[PDB]
Amino acid sequence: GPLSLSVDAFKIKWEFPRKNLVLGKTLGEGEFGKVVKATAFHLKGRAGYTTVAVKMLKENASPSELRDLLSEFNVLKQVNHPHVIKLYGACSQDGPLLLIVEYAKYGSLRGFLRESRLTMGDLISFAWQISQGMQYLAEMSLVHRDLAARNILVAEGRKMKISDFGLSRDVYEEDSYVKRSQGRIPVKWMAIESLFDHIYTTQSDVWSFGVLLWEIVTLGGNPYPGIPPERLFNLLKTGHRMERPDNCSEEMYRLMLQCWKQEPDKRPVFADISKDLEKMMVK
Amino acid sequence: GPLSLSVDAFKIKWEFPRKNLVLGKTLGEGEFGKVVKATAFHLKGRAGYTTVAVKMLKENASPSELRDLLSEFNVLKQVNHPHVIKLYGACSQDGPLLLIVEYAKYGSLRGFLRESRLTMGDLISFAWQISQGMQYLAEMSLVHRDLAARNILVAEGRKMKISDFGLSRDVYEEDSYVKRSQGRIPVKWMAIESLFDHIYTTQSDVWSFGVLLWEIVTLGGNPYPGIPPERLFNLLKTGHRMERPDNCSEEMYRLMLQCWKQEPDKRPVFADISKDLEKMMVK
Ligand SMILES: Cc1ccc(-c2nn(C(C)(C)C)c3ncnc(N)c23)cc1
């Protein structure tokens, strides 16, 4: 089927010797993958050991999780930008599939924020770096689909790295990705039209960006707090949106609202978003 | 879309007052659901409190997980058999969706087995009770799809209860369920034709039953140990199968093999399986 084809094609510059990789503690688990801290000997021109992160399948992986890991690999090969996690390689030939990437010292953005108390200007800087990465992926004709504080990494120097490319889809031909069956993206980050109509575009990424803004501004808050996901259908189509959080300027809130406009064409594009944020920074 | 329709239809005998339910410790998490121990006051004719288990959505649920929880509910309403977990009710009207079911004192079959050392006759008894439940579901025209030691519960008296109906599908019309996108069932329990062709039938359930037999016989072993899931495509179609485990009679092994025949029509049906196991019991 489509997977056996991919697996067979795959098994036929990115390959890294398994014997040169040493895995250590588990850094995190989750939807399709398990991530461990690791070290790699003689990695792509670097002398000695480099500290890296490695994603692999969890116990009892499904075809869906295998497909997602292969897809993330496929996407990460094609992208290169200061605000996107950097791929080093993979181990495929011996043992389970292992993807080797840049280690982000501070872990997830959500974790980093929740450990915090950081200025409003640090917050705007974070959002803006993410918007630049997103402007780059949108130019590559990729829809990311799973943008969220938990899927952004914070590297040395508090650099934002957009991560978790397992659900990212190429939209070169149509400028949208449409999925017949139900999505595996949390409902509380999905655009109204993704939720109801299974349509994903750069503008649905912009909606998710608005929820990410809310997460940044609340320092890792939980969106629509105390509201069950199943209530989102009706809440959204009756035109409700999250209220301005505490510690949020009105210009920041105004931007969140614009990202959550019902009509996708009415939301800003990532380039507008970046301009808006740089402007808040300098004022 | 199909989900908003279900959620709206749903929100329009099974309903239980949220105020009569008290939730306690987390019993387990996993693919679509979180399960907690709980107590329910005046549950369906029972005076006083009854100890129950409750499944709900995990944090950051996706449309796919919501759909699976609704589907499990829908299936559990229609089934009733001594070897299938019994539904009591749900809380929907206030707060998150909660499904209230029979509490299984010994937890999952896999956990129960791994805590063990139990006779061969206890083992055959377990398999046989599960085969009876499965013979009943097959007669109801349901394909279970996710049969595995982790999805069988052990209740008071060491009674097997088939559980986790989120992926079960009605096959009344065609005797098969076909899924275009990748399955969320672990690859190591899937029939060769489910893995390659996305076709699910009672006979693919029989394959999974063979893997479950292997799990019972090894006391909760890990199938195809040390073999990565992606190697299963080629291993399976080149005709390889797991070797006879230690502490396994040849008749038991012969049954596993028959469940794993390439041609689905060549595997036994659950009624043959039950006859085979009762025969091993009495001999
Ligand atoms: C392909 C791939 C590999 C690793 C990661 C990743 N996840 N995570 C967690 C989720 C533990 C914060 C990480 N933490 C630090 N550094 C990383 N590189 C990661 C993401 C994608």
Ligand SMILES: Cc1ccc(-c2nn(C(C)(C)C)c3ncnc(N)c23)cc1
């Ligand atoms: C709808 C539904 C509700 C609960 C369970 C369930 N899962 N589990 C675990 C997985 C913790 C062993 C249970 N353990 C004991 N009793 C139970 N009833 C369950 C399964 C399905």
